[PDB]
């Protein structure tokens, strides 16, 4: 029974040695022979107003035209981007929401927050209104993220320090993923929806297999809480944003860090991270009211999206990659192009 | 230059906007309080006088109060404490009889120091609600106050032992230029607690109005 604190250290050292052996070059060394992106001039096209409190979440539809936003005023608003019209305004039982999602088929939406319950709302009903299709309970902490799989399974993460894959038809936890030692702040779904990564407050990220139900790999390197995560469009890498004013790129196959995006004049944490359609750009929302655009091959800042009067809380990019939506704490969403 | 079907979507959006404005106007006139404590310190009693979040709604003198209680949130406070940034006041509950603790008084002091000097509550008032004023007499007649605060030197009566914990709790305040701590000793089977909360809320609202007008 004395093997504790000694066997694990030796296996960790073996893993470190393997990672060091597999490292021969860096992304910068290979990429230094690539033409720089250059200055990126993105400007606002539509300003979506109507929320009366801080906006905490936002998600794009799969048709790249409709989006959903959630704020602390207990409202879930569905916007039509092209004409800035309001399609639906769902009132919430609990006005402490911290996340929202849009179903891939466009039939349902999901919400959750400090009430530890994930609510599923049905948008296409014969009665002509929006009804609460389901209320999933079982988490012991505030929900922080939720993502639909197809139309009947949803993945959620909470401050309980566990993740859960549900089954909306019966409302039961089909699978539970454990292993984090701190609150789980976000998750991202792989394009093939067979794996997903989760970033926790113990300065770690973990890659879970949805079908098997067990952790595959663990990634470390940050010095503080991770509160944003996103997959590369390829599906073999991801990016993390933390509270130490640093973004990082991790790779699944090499099981190693690739490059860190940081600057001397940035000292505030990152709230949201997203990629572009081609994966060349990397957009990160910051606490100093701004949103930076990084050339995610040389770690060179290549643009700034200024125009918000408070902290930028949510960030998203359409599937066709023709616009970027940023929602901030001043109750405003902006569509940059 | 809009089609017939496109001109009705605009009307629907305008109706949605009007309903949203009405809801916001209705909601902005409600007082919001955040209830905090060290656990089993009298919060249940205070709620009686008037999973996750627990909301209690009540009415006093045609004024609507919503009080938010966090008891099941046994997680990192710093990840969700910024949600309650616009609350009118923080009602802090402390037990006067927990000075012996077989200890918990120091934990309560640490919690009060962390909450009062937070970067989000720079200008949010705290209403102190020292409870259990009845058991204090017996507990101070049996055991002395010297067990807690060893630097204390005074009579063991309910005139020096009390009104000394209040200064100990108030001295933890660092921003004595934009906040104000209202301290009250909870009564027994009386409505004076709601009156005290009402007076503190009125003062906070007057100050907020004077800030808003620009004076």
């Amino acid at each position, epitope marked *: 029974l004395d093997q504790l604190r000694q066997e694990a250290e030796q296996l960790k050292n073996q893993i470190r040695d393997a990672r060091k052996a597999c490292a021969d070059a860096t992304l910068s060394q290979i990429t230094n022979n690539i033409d720089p992106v250059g200055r990126i001039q993105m400007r606002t096209r539509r300003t979506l107003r109507g929320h009366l409190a801080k906006i905490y979440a936002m998600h794009w539809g799969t048709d790249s*035209r*409709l989006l959903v936003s959630a704020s602390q005023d207990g409202k879930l608003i569905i916007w*039509d981007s092209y004409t800035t*019209n309001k*399609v*639906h305004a769902i009132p919430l039982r609990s006005s402490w929401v911290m996340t929202c999602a849009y179903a891939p088929s466009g039939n349902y939406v999901a919400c959750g927050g400090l009430d530890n319950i994930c609510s599923i709302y049905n948008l296409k009903t*014969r*009665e*002509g*209104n929006v009804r609460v299709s389901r209320e999933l309970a079982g988490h012991t902490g505030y929900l922080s993220c939720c993502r639909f799989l197809d139309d009947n399974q949803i993945v959620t993460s909470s401050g309980d320090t566990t993740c859960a894959l549900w089954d909306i038809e019966t409302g039961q936890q089909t699978t539970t993923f454990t292993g984090h030692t701190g609150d789980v702040m976000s998750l991202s779904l792989a394009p093939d929806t067979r794996l997903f990564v989760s970033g926790a407050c113990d300065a770690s990220a973990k890659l879970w297999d949805v079908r098997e139900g067990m952790c595959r790999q663990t990634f470390t390197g940050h010095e503080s809480d991770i509160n944003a995560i996103c997959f590369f469009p390829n599906g073999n890498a991801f990016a993390t944003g933390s509270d130490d004013a640093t973004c990082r790129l991790f790779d699944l196959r090499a099981d190693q860090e690739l490059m860190t995006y940081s600057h001397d004049n940035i000292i505030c944490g990152i709230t949201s991270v997203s990629f572009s359609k081609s994966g060349r750009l990397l957009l990160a929302g910051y606490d100093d009211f701004n949103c930076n655009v990084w050339d995610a091959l040389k770690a060179d800042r290549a643009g700034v999206l200024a125009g918000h009067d408070n902290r930028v809380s949510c960030l998203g990019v359409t599937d066709d990659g023709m616009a970027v939506a940023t929602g901030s704490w001043d109750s405003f969403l902006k569509i940059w192009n | 230059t809009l*089609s*017939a*079907e*496109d001109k*009705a*979507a605009v*009307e*629907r959006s305008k*109706m949605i906007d009007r309903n949203l404005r009405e809801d916001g106007e209705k909601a902005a006139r409600e007082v919001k309080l955040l209830l905090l404590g060290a656990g089993e310190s009298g919060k249940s009693t205070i709620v009686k006088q008037m999973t996750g979040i627990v909301e209690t709604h009540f009415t006093f003198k045609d004024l609507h109060f919503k009080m938010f209680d966090v008891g099941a949130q046994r997680s990192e406070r710093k990840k969700w404490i910024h949600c309650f940034e616009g609350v009118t006041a923080i009602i802090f509950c402390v037990a006067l009889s927990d000075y012996d603790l077989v200890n918990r008084m120091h934990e309560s002091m640490k919690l009060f120091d962390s909450i009062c000097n937070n970067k989000w509550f720079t200008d949010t008032s705290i209403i102190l609600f020292l409870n259990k004023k009845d058991l204090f007499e017996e507990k101070i007649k049996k055991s002395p106050l010297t067990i807690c605060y060893p630097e204390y030197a005074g009579s063991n009566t309910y005139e020096e032992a009390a009104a000394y914990i209040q200064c100990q709790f108030e001295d933890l305040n660092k921003r004595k230029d934009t906040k104000e701590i209202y301290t009250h000793f909870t009564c027994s089977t009386d409505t004076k607690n709601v009156q005290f909360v009402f007076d503190a809320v009125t003062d906070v609202i007057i100050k907020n109005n004077l800030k808003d007008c620009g004076l």
Partner: single-chain antibody
Amino acid sequence: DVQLVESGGGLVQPGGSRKLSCSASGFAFSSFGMHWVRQAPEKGLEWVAYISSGSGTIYYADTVKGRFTISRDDPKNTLFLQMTSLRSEDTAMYYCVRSIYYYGSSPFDFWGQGTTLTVSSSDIVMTQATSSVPVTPGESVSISCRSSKSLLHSNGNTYLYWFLQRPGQSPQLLIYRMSNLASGVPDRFSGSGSGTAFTLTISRLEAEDVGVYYCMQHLEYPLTFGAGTKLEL
């Protein structure tokens, strides 16, 4: 379930007055625009009047203006049509239709039942150059509708609707905006065509499909129907 029940029809002397009522149960009546649609005893359909949701938009069909008045009572979920100075050219059956307008919605989805009136004794035109076409169960049939002005707005939406009316039943929605299929309609129905020329195709025809097919436009608000194509045998 959704239900619209109409009442207030009967024999009327010429020049008199009448009131028709439509009671709605099973859906959010307050958020639906409502239409009154006529049909002469042996003729095709004809739009009559329209009232919006949260009444702020009212339209009449250029022949009842100044004689008909449309109103709604949301708390009791009722729709009223007051008709004055009735003449012999008003003997018809009246239908109470609902329609909700937002991005991706399906207007005209549910039709009422009908009340019979028996009064004693710029305008796009849609052409259906076909009256009757014999069919057999198992084959495929095509119905063609033709417009005078192109029904293609700059948005990219073509505003054409295809309705079916079975023998002795209220019409039901088949196709909206020239390509989309209404909920509950079997896959064998399809719709296509370009501006000024549209087609509806039925593959593997079977029973309970014989009836009259109507094409409607929704570009400029004096909505116009087609003559109607009847399938027999």
